[PDB]
């Protein structure tokens, strides 16, 4: 008891030291510095395509590196690879388990990953000599549902799970190379840095952490939000990121400053955020909401700039092309629209 | 010129074949009804699943899938078992099932309030409105013997039971003692009060008393799903 009390007291002292350092590091705010910048309040765009064919609600999607082909996942048990320009279907992969929750597109273009409520990550081959798409590897070892996955290259992939940990795999041998064991609640999202040397993750406990891929331990923690974090995305230059939470706000964090420095909220907005994404330059911030809309924020002024209406149900996923030419959004109404 | 030829070939072959396969898949998909099984460790939901699997699983990774068929209509039930305590995130993958099966153990009063709270939390979720619930009270035999023995009294956990009076619509079984019926209907009325307090016309709850020897549960689920689908059709076809 006495030792436990001493440990708790010294933890409180370290917390106070960190808070004092954070307070000292703050001498201004984004609002004051950016007050002179002109706004972009003339943002308005309309849907240019509508992809049909999925039987049930869409849970995830991911662009290809060429920004022409994209893969989508639906809870009826299908992975469909569309051609964006002509709206043609290229492939259609049936899945063993229909409760898929995530999907990824290999940067090389040869594979697609999949996973969900089965605690497995399946790798599919799109360029087999026989001219068919077949399973080539299954990754097992997580004790909770799979929430996200991302390819590093043809051989390794990093995943997050509902068991509060993240892992790094080697596809050829299907073995866990590293494990990350910092969070306290479910991990809901991932995001890789442009150089693939770090990544961030947000959990059900209202905090986010930064990881070192090779070293294997956490380096920072951010505790600004009030409820579960549902989405996370790195900034183009790789020195900041943004999160979406169930408390109906978004916030932008600062790796170097270790501090939160912006909030995006409105009085009449009461629902939560489901997805976020940055534009090519980082001046815009797109977020999907539990209400069937999608709001375009001003990442520097923090005032709204537009809206994307037209879905008849909850907006679930969101993505932007590598060349910043189009935005794709899926929804629980089972349609996948392309805007602008 | 070769680009036009390639585009024509890709369009024709790929899109036509894929669309035909998708239509074939949709035909099968629309002809099956899927159900979610919920319960606690001391309940007997797995027992019922096994019973109708015998009466009428592969790829089990914590999820026990079961199939059965009544009057040539196909059903598919799922039982998530590979997850830990917290439920509030993976529960919304089931926002478009026909019904949710909720099983309770009514012979143990010390765990009754936990089931009451879980039912109340499910009934009021943002994404689980519009989904009906089938309610099974699973251990009527144990409850009957427990009440007959008289070792423990219900009023300690629920003091309101002292002033309870049996409802008129109650239809006791031929050989039932009045006080066992009183207790069981009281426990049922608790759940029904939570259900009717703040529900709506887009929501319903069907209760049934069940045991570990019953073999009518498949037909109960069938009839309740028929009622649910008819009520949805009334609204779809602009009669409501």
């Amino acid at each position, epitope marked *: 008891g006495s030792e436990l009390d001493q440990l708790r007291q010294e933890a409180e002292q370290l917390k106070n030291q960190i808070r004092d350092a954070r307070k000292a590091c703050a001498d201004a705010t984004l609002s004051q510095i950016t007050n002179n910048i002109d706004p972009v309040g003339r943002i308005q765009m309309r849907t240019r395509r509508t992809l049909r064919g999925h039987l049930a609600k869409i849970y995830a999607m991911h662009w290809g590196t060429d920004s022409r082909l994209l893969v989508s996942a639906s809870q009826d048990g299908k992975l469909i690879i569309w051609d964006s320009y002509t709206t043609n279907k290229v492939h259609a992969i049936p899945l063993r388990s229909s409760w898929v929750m995530t999907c990824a597109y290999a940067p090389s273009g040869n594979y697609v990953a999949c996973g969900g409520l089965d605690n497995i990550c399946s790798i599919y081959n799109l360029k087999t000599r026989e001219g068919n798409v077949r399973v080539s590897r299954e990754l097992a070892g997580h004790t909770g549902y799979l929430s996200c996955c991302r390819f590093l290259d043809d051989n390794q992939i990093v995943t997050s799970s509902g068991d509060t940990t993240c892992a790094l795999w080697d596809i050829e041998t299907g073995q866990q190379t590293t494990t990350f064991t910092g969070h306290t609640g479910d991990v809901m999202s991932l995001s890789l840095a442009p150089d693939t040397r770090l990544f961030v993750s947000g959990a*059900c406990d209202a905090s986010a952490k930064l990881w070192d891929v090779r070293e294997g331990m956490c380096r920072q923690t951010f505790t600004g939000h009030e*409820s579960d974090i549902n989405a996370i995305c790195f900034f183009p230059n790789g020195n900041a990121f943004a999160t979406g939470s169930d408390d*109906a706000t978004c916030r932008l964090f600062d790796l170097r400053a270790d501090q939160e420095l912006m909030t995006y909220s409105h009085d009449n907005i009461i629902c939560g955020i489901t997805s976020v994404s940055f534009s090519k330059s980082g001046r815009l911030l797109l977020a999907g909401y539990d209400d069937f809309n999608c709001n375009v924020w001003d990442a520097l002024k923090a005032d709204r700039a537009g809206v994307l209406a037209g879905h008849d149900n909850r907006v679930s996923c969101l993505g932007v092309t590598d060349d910043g030419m189009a935005v794709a959004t899926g929804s629980w109404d089972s349609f996948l629209k392309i805007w602008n | 010129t070769e680009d036009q030829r390639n585009e024509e070939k890709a369009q024709r072959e790929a899109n036509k074949k894929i669309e035909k396969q998708l239509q074939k898949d949709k035909q099968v998909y629309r002809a099956t009804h899927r159900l979610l099984l919920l319960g606690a460790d001391n309940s007997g939901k797995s027992t019922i699943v096994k019973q109708m699997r015998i009466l009428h699983s592969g790829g089990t990774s914590g999820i026990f899938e079961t199939k059965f068929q009544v009057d040539k209509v196909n059903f598919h039930m799922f039982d998530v078992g590979g997850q830990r305590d917290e439920r509030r995130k993976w529960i919304q993958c089931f926002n478009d099932v026909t019904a949710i099966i909720f099983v309770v153990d009514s012979s143990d009063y010390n765990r009754l*309030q*936990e089931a009451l709270n879980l039912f109340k939390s499910i009934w*009021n979720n*943002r994404w689980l409105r519009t989904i009906s619930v089938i309610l099974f009270l699973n251990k009527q035999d144990l409850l009957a013997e427990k009440v007959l023995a008289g070792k423990s009294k219900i009023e300690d956990y629920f003091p309101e039971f002292a002033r309870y009076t049996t409802p008129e619509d109650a239809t006791p079984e031929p050989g039932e003692d009045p006080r066992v019926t009183r207790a069981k209907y009281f426990i049922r009325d608790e759940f029904l009060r939570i259900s009717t307090a703040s529900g709506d016309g887009r929501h319903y709850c069907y209760p049934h008393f069940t045991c570990a020897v019953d073999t009518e549960n498949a037909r109960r689920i069938f009839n309740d799903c028929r009622d649910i689908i008819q009520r949805m059709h009334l609204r779809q076809y602009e009669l409501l």
Partner: nanobody, 128 residues
Framework: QVQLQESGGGLVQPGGSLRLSCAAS????????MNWVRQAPGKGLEWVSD????????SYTGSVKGRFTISRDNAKNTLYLQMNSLKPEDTAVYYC?????????????????????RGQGTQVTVSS
């Protein structure tokens, strides 16, 4: 940084009285609803009482009905539990809990193990 700190408690004779206080910081107190949860020796977490945002819609577990009372103070971000007529079966740690989402009337995982938005607890012992 969500944190909740409990106070009060100690040794009390059967039929005694105590007042538990729970100070909250780091969130809007009035948007969420609050609960009381206790863990007796050799037992799991157990739900006791809850109170809605405004102050109406109170609820209790039956074993403590007519004995304990719950209330809010939205101006001070504090929660209370006036205990009286204590019995030996009330010896346990008492945690201060709150729901995961603000504008909701469902509270899913408040009684789980390793739930994040819960307090450290305070020991209440009743004996002679």
């Amino acid at each position: 940084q969500v944190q909740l700190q409990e106070s009060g408690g100690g040794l009390v004779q059967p039929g005694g009285s105590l007042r538990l206080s729970c100070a909250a910081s780091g969130f809007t107190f009035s948007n969420y609803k609050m609960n009381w949860v206790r863990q007796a020796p050799g037992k799991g977490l157990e739900w006791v009482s809850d109170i809605s945002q405004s102050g109406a819609s109170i609820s209790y577990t039956g074993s403590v009905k007519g004995r304990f009372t719950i209330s809010r103070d939205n101006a001070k971000n504090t929660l209370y539990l006036q205990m009286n007529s204590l019995k030996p079966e009330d010896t346990a740690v008492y945690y201060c809990a709150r729901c995961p989402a603000p504008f909701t009337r469902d509270c899913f995982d408040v009684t789980s193990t390793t739930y994040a938005y819960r307090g450290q607890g305070t020991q209440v012992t009743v004996s002679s």
